[PDB]
Amino acid sequence: ICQFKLVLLGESAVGKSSLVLRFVKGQFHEYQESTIGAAFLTQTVCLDDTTVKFEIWDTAGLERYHSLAPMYYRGAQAAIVVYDITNTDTFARAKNWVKELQRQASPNIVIALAGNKADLASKRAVEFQEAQAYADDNSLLFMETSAKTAMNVNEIFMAIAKKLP
Ligand SMILES: Nc1nc2c(ncn2[C@@H]2O[C@H](COP(=O)(O)OP(=O)(O)O)[C@@H](O)[C@H]2O)c(=O)[nH]1
Ligand SMILES: [Mg+2]
């Protein structure tokens, strides 16, 4: 039985909570509350005879209060940095979050980059090619995801579970 704190980071409204709720609760909503606070969810996945138990922390308010972020990712063994593929600024912001984790999070943290809202590719602003090369250059797990269609949601968390010590 392995236990790992997993956190999500990214600009407001990229779909951090939606990804958690799809993975944990098999739910998606076009409306999602964004009220300041934190939720502690748990999700256990299995790999052979190994039980990977995620402690999933999801928070609202780190966009308003960026300097409080260290309180949130401290002790995190995994992080999902999320951007919205239809918003170039969220991708730039994701890169900042990745940089911060590299400088300030545990040195062995597993970081995945999630190109979210992939179901909205009609308005794509971030090319997968570019994000892929970025992730490769930084040794990041990377997938495009959708909380709405669940595309790659199971995949991204299983990949994290596999990459963890
Ligand atoms: N179409 C689509 N909408 C999404 C997706 N993920 C999140 N959203 C929407 O984006 C808005 C913000 O989502 P939320 O999970 O609260 O983002 P957060 O602030 O990062 O936690 C909500 O209206 C969601 O329904 C997705 O994969 N596809
Ligand atoms: Mg949220």
Curated annotation (Swiss-Prot):
Cofactor(s) of this protein: Mg(2+)
Compartment(s): Cell membrane; Early endosome membrane; Melanosome
Residue interval(s) of motif Switch 1: 27-39
Domain of life: Eukaryota
EC identifiers of the protein: 3.6.5.2
Its membrane topology: Lipid-anchor
Keywords of the record: Cell membrane, Endosome, GTP-binding, Hydrolase, Lipoprotein, Magnesium, Membrane, Metal-binding, Nucleotide-binding, Phosphoprotein, Prenylation, Protein transport, Transport
GO cellular component: early endosome membrane; endocytic vesicle; lipid droplet; melanosome; plasma membrane
One of the protein's GO biological processes: plasma membrane to endosome transport
Positions bound to GTP: 12-13, 15-18, 29-30, 35, 61, 116-117, 119, 147-148
Top-level EC class: hydrolase
Residues with Phosphoserine modification: S67
Activity regulation, per record: Regulated by guanine nucleotide exchange factors (GEFs) which promote the exchange of bound GDP for free GTP. Regulated by GTPase activating proteins (GAPs) which increase the GTP hydrolysis activity. Inhibited by GDP dissociation inhibitors (GDIs).
Residues noted as binding Mg(2+) in the record, renumbered to the chain: S17, T35
Chain span(s) of sequence motif Switch 2: 60-76
Subunit structure: Interacts with EEA1 and INCA1. Interacts with GDI1, GDI2, CHML and CHM; phosphorylation at Ser-67 disrupts this interaction.
Function (record text): The small GTPases Rab are key regulators of intracellular membrane trafficking, from the formation of transport vesicles to their fusion with membranes. Rabs cycle between an inactive GDP-bound form and an active GTP-bound form that is able to recruit to membranes different sets of downstream effectors directly responsible for vesicle formation, movement, tethering and fusion.
Family: Belongs to the small GTPase superfamily. Rab family.
Name of the protein in its database record: Ras-related protein Rab-5C
Organism, as annotated: Mus musculus
Gene responsible for this protein: Rab5c
Span of the entire protein shown here: 19 to 183 of 216
